[PDB]
Symmetry: D3
Subunit: 256 residues, 6 copies
């Protein structure tokens, strides 16, 4: 198994003792994802990518963070929706910080944080800095962290054209849209009912944000773009591209 | 599905709209469990129990807390072991607090926290208190919480007698022993290898604790008792007793 | 000379720590209801009295005690809904323990005994200790050693237990305001106990789970979890000698001269 | 009359809020390196200058700006390893925003515009707002409204973008110490810019991931993420008018008189 | 009938609060070095003794005192570099005060007097009060009132001052371990004072600024900021009567029956 | 060359720190009501102006000032109940000071002067400094030195006081919006002062204790604690010269070039 949770402490110890062990931590959320998809998408997707990447490069995957930061209107619909269960920034930051501290204690020195929930980014960044700060007090400067949101690896114009023959709309509105829905159709079809997709024009907003969040400014379904054209085929493409790209990136930053 | 993460936000909203929806939250840890068992035991077990109880009483299960409080020598071997990845008390407390705040926002008013890691108890307690304190600030006083550790429902003398024809020696030393190992053999046999069990005598300690934790005071394998006599059958019985007992307790506290 | 740090001059304290093997003791209690027959500072008074006697025997020093502890829980203290009980949030207690260890380490002390007298304090004392040791480690300090214990855990001799609990040991959690604490109080501070006000009720029992908000009905009306009807000075004196002796021996073993 | 709260007496401020529809604006910046050609308080100076001009047009008031912001990130500000850059922890910035909102609500104010000038501040400003609104709700207050924006987002007109970047727009992320900010500075504070010191390097490019500890080698030597060689006072005046007009209109829309 | 809450049963306490105009008093001290002639728990002992006497006269109740206070400052307590002195971080002290007020309010109490005995505690007590009142407001509670004071501020009469300091008033800040505190201790706890060990140095003087890390050389070697050579039980009795009467009167005025 | 860090390039800043003896100065103020005759940013403007002049004379650099300070207290600033005054919680201010010191240390700086302009900030500045020095100690760094001062403490010469107050000085406590601050403002920013609006009331006096919630009636209606009727540009110029000279000499003493 490539999952730390499924290993005995002895097996884990031996792997870290190897010296070049790479650990991966998926960071997701419990968030509404329209009428056609379930709410644990942000955990399921990066976890599936982590598993596949780990199998290829000989890495290990830590239990994923199930709850993430508050959903923002322009990227995830808004934290006013039912189901969405978000943590305060301090809580998410502290969780990341605590995990890094513990991994360093084990003797680990290579960590990849794979974000699957757009809004988590800056709090992950702060948790990393606080953990690295503490390691520095002990004179430790060899703990290295690579942070990434898996969708950023789908850049190849050729790939983008296949997935979006009519044009890429941007990652900000890819919440419950073609990208996430296609991956889900390929990985967990039973958790997706494309027939329930509520077609609507791609969400647009003015150059600013308003709080309290105005529910009227988010498409009724909660999605920011339609997944009507999502498909298992597109999902298989996205999956291979991400796994390959991320596997290469990790081998690059954490070589033998 | 009985898992909130596998529902759409509309399906979840509908269940809460019913008025008497009971939500369940498993709280575990990533911790060493000897040479014969994996490290996510404390998440897997309460989650499996929650699932079965939820199926029986029509409740829903929230994503579980994967990381818990620091392992203590007398109950989990100690936080010095590799693999064990623990959170600070404030972090765990804050996580529980944030989740309750969000569930209340959804309109939910009935929550069952099922602890699977001994050491989490008091921090779960503080998280609950802080969240209820805030709810009262908003005039909300109808949010009710039931907290329990699933093993406390295995107290019937006849059951203990059948499970331990030699004698029960308390839940304290039941870390990686007969109880947890038997449950795992019944639910996830592939994650257990009885041939690797180190059959040492029950762990004993003086009436006080020492910090920094002294490794010599914990049996080398990390277990506090031998799981040599663990069996699938013992696990099936434990599972039956726990599910029935918790289901009855929840119906009592959260009637239709 | 006094065994209490508070009654020493800084020069005397400094000299004792300069010795090199000085052991410090910190009582951790609470302000909590203890039925109709006993006062509310029991959890401070008792561990403080034990520390004093242990200190006198092994040559240790006792720090001012923590007067307020963690929230009373229904199954071990009656519940935090009772009047009088004044509790701190976990972070507050944890931080207090953390600050004190930091300061003792600054003084040059390296041996500390935390003696808990309020059941609910345990885990927050543990977190306070971990956070303080973590910070000491940042400065390369790994020789600070801590021994934490709840004084009642030393009362284990089958023979002594039989006298206190003729019908069986009820468990340290439901001992709140019962025979154990009341007997000690009768022996140490009789003026603060009125055995005639004891409301005799059966030992408190609870289901295998807890409910919040706490339900007042599931706690005996007087606030006690077990009856102190049979409490006596004699039982108190026995408990006292057993604790002092056992704790003194434990400290001598962990912190040898 | 001044549009800055700091330059008013408390009586004058009180009267303005008593008006009932008073709009307050808070500039949120940072002290951060901005290449060899510009000073380090750019992120405070620019949003404050924009706030002043917007306030003059719509009759709003401007609060003292936040001088220190969140840690500079490699992909958007060069990195927090540079000298001069003085950053706050996320909790500190969030708490500052939170405290100010709480206080303004106490004054009776209910309309606030937070104008961010430092790319990295965004999410911590967002958390500060959420925590403050949460507290207001506890006190039964639900009419406090907040508008948050990063001023450069108002430069949307394809015609304006083309004038600034005739060879193509490469994004706001690498617009640190580049054409955009440098042009505005040339138009507002020319004495604080030495265009002759601009190190004309190719625009910064990074792989689809982040690495920590930040690797200095992955940031252009000067600290800038794009060359300001083509910056000019003319471009600056266009940007200024575009931002002021757009924001003024947005506020009139969200906070009608 | 004891005036200490800790020595009451929860029923007795409940009955007192039920009165409707009950006044609670909380001593806030510290564990701090006090020269070669006095013990280190002075800051707790003195305000507690004053609270007890005031309570007896006005029918109030006294809560367990805070044993540890904020970090000793050079100009008012000698400095936190001294052995023995065991200080809390500001957040810890503030949080302790906050938790206590929250609980007292839960009991139904609405009148609290915080009597400070350690100079440096003041602003953290103030913050704890503000945060507690803020929370009470969220709960719709606005009738909780707090009076905070440092007992020495009540010694104002010129005649009294001259009797105490024939050479001239030195200011309450340098009155650390000097005539004022030592005299009170001589009148209240003579066994904890050895006037023969007093080091008769001239009053400490400092430039108009502070330096950190604290420089030990800038504090008189004994730790005292002024000489207690002329301290006496007679002066102690005078101070005690002035403080008790003045405070009793002030409380009667702020918390009328 | 500017003495303000914000107006320097990171290269210029780096070079100055490289000198190995660079002194950094941080103004710490507040946004607070200052009567009917003066604006609310006084506490930022004054220490910043003093820092600028001192820096010009001794070759130091000035950091962006803290614009918001701790909650106004009745006896020193009128009270936090006034409109306009926008205060931070203690933890927020302490955290801001702490974060800035961490960053300056990272830059390689080791000499810092914090110039307080708001009475109430003092203890939180102190705690921020302690927490920062504590963390530096975790990294084996103990050569970072901090000097903290409130600029008005340098106006102590009897001859100067006599010239400024030919009718008698009554202390710094009541100098909120009075002669001292108003005179400085008249000399530095005359347009922000309108002496004709001064409410000439008698000096504020208070009992030896404080009450919370704060009672508005106990503060002079205008918000000032003493009348600035006799304030003048001349008095302001004198105060400025004395403060700048005194502070410059103190800094040279503590941080020799
Ligand atoms: Mn998401
Ligand atoms: Mn466990
Ligand atoms: Mn207790
Ligand atoms: Mn920036
Ligand atoms: Mn003191
Ligand atoms: Mn002020
Ligand atoms: Zn998603
Ligand atoms: Zn387990
Ligand atoms: Zn007790
Ligand atoms: Zn910038
Ligand atoms: Zn003292
Ligand atoms: Zn002022």
């Amino acid at each position: 198994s490539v999952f730390v949770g499924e290993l005995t402490w002895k097996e884990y110890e031996a792997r870290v003792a190897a010296g070049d062990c790479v650990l991966m931590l998926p960071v997701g959320a419990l968030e509404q994802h329209g009428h056609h998809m379930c709410m644990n998408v942000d955990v399921l997707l990066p976890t599936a990518v982590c598993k596949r990447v780990a199998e290829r490069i000989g890495a290990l995957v830590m239990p994923g963070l199930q709850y993430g930061y508050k959903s923002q209107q322009k990227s995830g619909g808004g934290n006013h929706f039912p189901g969405t269960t978000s943590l305060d920034g301090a809580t998410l930051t502290g969780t990341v910080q605590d995990i890094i501290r513990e991994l360093a204690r084990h003797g680990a020195r290579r960590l990849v944080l794979m974000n699957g929930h757009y809004e988590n980014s800056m709090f992950i960044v702060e948790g990393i800095d606080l953990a690295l700060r503490e390691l520095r007090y002990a004179g430790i400067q060899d703990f290295k962290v690579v942070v990434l949101s898996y969708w950023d690896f789908v850049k190849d114009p050729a790939v983008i054209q296949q997935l979006y023959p009519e044009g890429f709309l941007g990652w900000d509105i890819e919440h419950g849209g073609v990208f996430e829905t296609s991956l889900m159709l390929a990985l967990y079809p039973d958790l997706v009912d494309l027939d329930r997709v509520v077609d609507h024009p791609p969400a647009t907003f003015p150059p600013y944000d308003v709080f309290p969040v105005d529910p009227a400014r988010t498409p009724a379904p909660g999605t920011l773009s339609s997944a009507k054209t999502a498909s298992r085929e597109k999902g298989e493409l996205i999956l291979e591209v991400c796994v390959q790209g991320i596997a290469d990136a990790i081998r690059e930053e954490f070589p033998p």
